């Protein structure tokens, strides 16, 4: 009760939002208020921040606070294990990883808002969600101007090096062509994302607006799309399932009554948070982005198991004229999706993405209705309707992903510039 009010007043004066968020969090951990600590966490504020004596004065809880205490110390002193785990994961990542969406949480929240505003549900008979902007992420060419040691640090902090090594060194999943990766400057980079599930959604957003799926906006759209378009996707799925077993030469069958339950479940997948999503979900996402999604993944991983994720996901249920030709690329390893992005040409950047594997075999086109199956001649013809394709000098069939500096989204540009500032200001 005995507070020097003059002193207090002077202190409060010099305080900004992030100070209040810090001090609120300090009380938060005393009190067991997880929102108070999440709120500080998502501000991007240093979880290592230590209480100053002024802050201790302002707080006025002798039993609880002292100069030098951090949130982590408060969390041990009181019994908040929950919080400790969040705190320590945050600290670990902050030191190993620094991606564009973490550099300025207010701006990434503006980006989220812009994506939400851009997202609508089609009226009429096919009530699928859809975006209204075409946005594609490329690493900035300015990276090449960094000092070598700074480049490696930047790559350590934005790439998933483990995923890169399995897609590129351990087997020829990506960058297997000298021509594409080097002569034509189309080397692909696997962006890191946290594995706490939802890698699919985080990956699509990273390939696209450069952020993760904050506050689950993309996910809810995906969920509501599947639910409100159930019968549309159900039919494509049923054939996709039969497609497979068709390939082992095995003649099977299910009772309509039973396709039903198997459908109801994958329907729950999008609602149950952090569960695993499968190819039907990639298919729906291609509709929501109004563009193709190419997935590169192992040819057969476990070999205890064959894989069926690799291939091309076309937004087949829209009119072609409704859809952009430019695709995004995702990499698939062991139950995990990664955004695969190229570096900008060092005007227009053209990234050449192969529509064949390293053995030059056409990638699979998923969810094709039997009325669409056909020769390799015919498949390729389909791919040419939906993508902007050409054949390299070396003979590789590729889809082109074209982007322009001019057409880049301004908030994305600002975020990428601020992320680069962190490396540009490093001496040496």
Active site (catalytic) residues: 199, 336
Which of these ranges, 7-15, 202-210, 234-242, 314-322, lies near Cl ion under the rule CB under 5 A? 234-242
Nearer to Cl ion, 259 or 318 (CB): 259
> Does 22 engage in binding with Cl ion (CB under 5 A)?
no
Asked whether the beta carbons of 1 and 61 are under 8 A apart, the reply is: no
Nearer to Cl ion, 221 or 226 (CB): 226
Nearer to Cl ion, 259 or 301 (CB): 259
Give min distance, CB of 231 to Cl ion, in A: 5
Nearer to Cl ion, 50 or 230 (CB): 230
Nearer to Cl ion, 37 or 229 (CB): 229
Closest-by-Cβ residue to Cl ion is 234
Which of these ranges, 224-232, 284-292, 330-338, 357-365, lies near Cl ion under the rule CB under 5 A? 224-232
Give min distance, CB of 230 to Cl ion, in A: 5
Which of these ranges, 212-220, 230-238, 345-353, 378-386, lies near Cl ion under the rule CB under 5 A? 230-238
CA angle 313, 218, 335 (to 5 degrees): 55
Nearer to Cl ion, 283 or 352 (CB): 283
Give min distance, CB of 407 to Cl ion, in A: 40
Give min distance, CB of 91 to Cl ion, in A: 46
Give the whole-angstrom CA distance, residue 400 versus residue 423: 30
Give min distance, CB of 235 to Cl ion, in A: 8
Residue among 395, 393, 397, 371 nearest 383 (CA): 397
> Does 386 engage in binding with Cl ion (CB under 5 A)?
no
> Does 234 engage in binding with Cl ion (CB under 5 A)?
yes
Cα–Cα distances in angstroms (integers) from residue 50 to residues 46, 81, 188, in the given order? 9, 20, 41
- Binding-site size, Cl ion (CB under 5 A): 2
Site of tokens 């960094």 = 146
Q: Which of 93-98's residues contact partners 24+ apart within 8 Å by CB, and which partners? A: 93/194, 94/47, 96/156, 96/157, 97/157, 97/158, 97/192, 98/157, 98/158, 98/419, 98/422
Nearer to Cl ion, 230 or 378 (CB): 230
Q: Looking at the DSSP assignment, which residues form a beta bridge with residue 407?
A: none
Give the whole-angstrom CA distance, residue 338 versus residue 203: 5
How far, rounded to the nearest angstrom, does the alpha carbon of residue 372 sit from its chain's CA centroid? 31
Residue 250: burial class (beta carbons within 10 Å; 0-12, 13-18, 19+): exposed
What DSSP state is assigned to residue 361?
P
Which of these ranges, 163-171, 173-181, 182-190, 226-234, lies near Cl ion under the rule CB under 5 A? 226-234
* Max CA separation in the chain (angstroms): 86
Which of these ranges, 160-168, 233-241, 295-303, 309-317, lies near Cl ion under the rule CB under 5 A? 233-241
Count CB neighbours of 367 within 10 A: 23
Give min distance, CB of 260 to Cl ion, in A: 7
Nearer to Cl ion, 256 or 347 (CB): 256
Which of these ranges, 15-23, 155-163, 228-236, 308-316, lies near Cl ion under the rule CB under 5 A? 228-236
Name the E strands within 264-388: 293-297, 311-313, 328-333, 336-342, 348-354
Cα–Cα distances in angstroms (integers) from residue 388 to residues 209, 230, 327, 331, in the given order? 22, 30, 9, 21
HSE of 328 in the Cβ direction (CA atoms, 13 Å)?
33
Q: Which residues contact Cl ion (rule: CB under 5 A)? A: 230, 234
């Amino acid at each position: 009760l005995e507070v020097d009010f003059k002193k207090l007043k002077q202190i409060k004066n010099r305080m900004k939002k992030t100070d209040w968020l810090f001090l609120n969090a300090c009380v938060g951990v005393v009190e067991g208020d997880l929102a108070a600590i999440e709120a500080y966490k998502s501000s991007g504020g240093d979880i290592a921040r230590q209480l100053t004596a002024d802050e201790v004065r302002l707080l006025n809880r002798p039993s609880a606070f002292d100069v030098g205490y951090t949130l982590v110390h408060l969390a041990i002193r009181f019994q908040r294990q929950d919080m400790l785990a969040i705190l320590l994961t945050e600290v670990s990542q902050q030191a190993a990883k620094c991606i564009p969406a973490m550099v300025c949480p207010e701006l990434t929240e503006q980006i989220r808002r812009e994506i939400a505003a851009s997202l609508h549900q089609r009226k009429g008979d096919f009530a699928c969600y859809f975006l209204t902007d075409l946005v594609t992420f490329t690493l900035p060419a300015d990276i090449e101007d960094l000092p070598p040691t700074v480049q490696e640090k930047l790559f350590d902090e934005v790439l998933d090096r483990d995923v890169q090594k399995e897609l590129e060194e351990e087997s020829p999943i990506i960058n297997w062509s000298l021509e594409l990766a080097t002569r034509l400057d189309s080397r692909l980079y696997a962006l890191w994302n946290r594995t706490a599930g939802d890698c699919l959604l985080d990956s699509v957003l990273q390939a696209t607006w450069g952020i993760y799926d904050k506050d689950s906006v993309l996910r809810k759209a995906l969920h509501d799309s599947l639910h409100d378009c159930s019968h549309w996707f159900y039919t494509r799925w049923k054939d996709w399932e039969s497609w497979y077993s068709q390939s082992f030469g095995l003649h099977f069958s299910l009772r309509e009554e039973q396709w039903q339950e198997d459908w109801a479940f994958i329907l729950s997948l999008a609602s149950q948070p952090g569960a695993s999503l499968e190819q039907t979900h990639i298919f729906v996402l291609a509709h929501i982005l109004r563009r193709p999604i190419i997935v590169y993944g192992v040819k057969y991983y476990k070999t205890l198991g064959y894989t069926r994720f690799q291939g091309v996901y076309l937004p087949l249920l829209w009119e072609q004229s409704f859809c952009w030709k430019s695709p995004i690329a995702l990499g698939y390893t062991r139950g995990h999706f990664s955004a695969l992005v190229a570096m900008e040409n060092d005007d227009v950047t053209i990234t050449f993405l192969p529509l064949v594997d390293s053995e030059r075999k056409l990638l699979h086109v998923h969810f094709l209705s039997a009325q669409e199956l056909g020769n390799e001649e015919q498949q390729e013809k389909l791919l040419r309707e939906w993508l902007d394709c050409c054949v390299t000098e070396g003979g590789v069939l590729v889809a082109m992903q074209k982007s322009s500096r001019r057409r880049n989204h301004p908030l994305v540009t600002q975020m990428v510039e601020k992320w680069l500032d962190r490396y540009r200001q490093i001496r040496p």
